Design an enzyme around this catalytic site. Structure first.
Site, PDB file in Angstrom:
ATOM      1  CB  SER A  77      -0.990  -0.076   1.149  1.00 20.67           C
ATOM      2  OG  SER A  77      -1.962   0.934   1.018  1.00 20.67           O
TER       3      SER A  77
ATOM      4  CG  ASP B 172      -7.834  -2.367  -2.205  1.00 23.46           C
ATOM      5  OD1 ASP B 172      -8.199  -1.643  -1.253  1.00 23.46           O
ATOM      6  OD2 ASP B 172      -6.639  -2.637  -2.463  1.00 23.46           O
TER       7      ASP B 172
ATOM      8  CG  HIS C 131      -5.944  -2.170   1.204  1.00 20.74           C
ATOM      9  ND1 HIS C 131      -5.447  -1.774  -0.022  1.00 20.74           N
ATOM     10  CD2 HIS C 131      -5.232  -1.511   2.136  1.00 20.74           C
ATOM     11  CE1 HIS C 131      -4.471  -0.901   0.180  1.00 20.74           C
ATOM     12  NE2 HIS C 131      -4.310  -0.733   1.483  1.00 20.74           N
TER      13      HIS C 131
END
Length: 251
Positions: A94, A193, A223
């Site tokens: 991320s 996500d 995610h």
């Protein structure tokens, strides 16, 4: 009430190949430890820093931002360099994904793995929610009453969180720089996500100038892909990716 023990970095010494592992916003080295353990078992050395402000009270987190976190990431790169690893690949979750791309056009990097890195706008509200969630959870673990959490949560909401827009600025800048990246790149995206606009991964895939590039979609993951149910497939894919890179000094 109770002090909460902060998280530590990790360094898994194995072999002459090196991988920097970079975690998510509000997370820590735990986000990437299992991947570290797997790569180490395949003979890859692994370092995972912790960003400043992370794994500590939420009031301390909002005194930090990407200038600080970038410094821990750069310090992690230098750590492997100084222990003598010349070729370093990088792999990020991320926010860690965004720092890995940034590292891509800043220092020599054997390869980039970017896992569910955000490039648009859903990130902006879910980063706020994520921060609130970390805060309630940290407050709970330290053993505070519900009423004291409610009090300290209202105060937290009404105090400066400038780190949230600094994050959006990082995102834009890295994105504006994607066409400077030539290093082989593996884009990894979770289909479902709920934290980011997943088309973000098309963005990364399309706009980099890397001759070598791949994208995989993961249909059963959310995610946080490193801790979700397809992680063992991800381990393999990332391993195969690293094995496909150069790693040799050419004459």
């Amino acid at each position: 009430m109770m002090k909460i023990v902060p998280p530590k970095p990790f360094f898994f010494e194995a072999g002459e190949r090196a991988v920097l592992l970079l975690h998510g916003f509000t997370g820590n080295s735990a986000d990437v430890r299992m991947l570290g353990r797997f790569l180490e078992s395949k003979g890859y050395t692994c370092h995972a820093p912790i960003y400043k402000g992370h794994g500590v009270p939420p009031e301390e987190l909002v005194h930090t931002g990407p200038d600080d976190w970038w410094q821990d990431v750069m310090n992690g790169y230098e750590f492997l360099k100084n222990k003598g690893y010349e070729k370093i690949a990088v792999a990020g979750l991320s926010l860690g994904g965004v720092f890995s791309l940034k590292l891509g056009y800043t220092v020599p990097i054997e390869g980039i793995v970017t896992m569910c890195a955000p490039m648009y706008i859903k990130s902006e509200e879910t980063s706020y929610e994520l921060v609130l969630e970390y805060a309630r959870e940290y407050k709970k673990r330290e053993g505070k009453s519900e009423e004291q959490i409610e009090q300290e949560m209202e105060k937290f909401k009404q105090t400066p969180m400038k780190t949230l827009k600094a994050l959006q600025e990082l995102k834009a800048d890295v994105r504006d720089h994607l066409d400077l990246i030539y290093a082989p790149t593996f884009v990894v995206q979770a289909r479902h996500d709920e934290m980011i606009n997943p088309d973000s991964a098309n963005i990364i895939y399309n706009e980099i100038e890397s001759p070598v590039k791949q994208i995989k979609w993961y249909e059963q993951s959310g995610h946080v892909i490193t801790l979700d149910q397809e992680k063992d497939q991800l381990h393999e894919d990332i391993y195969a990716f690293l094995e496909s890179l150069d790693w040799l000094e050419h004459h």
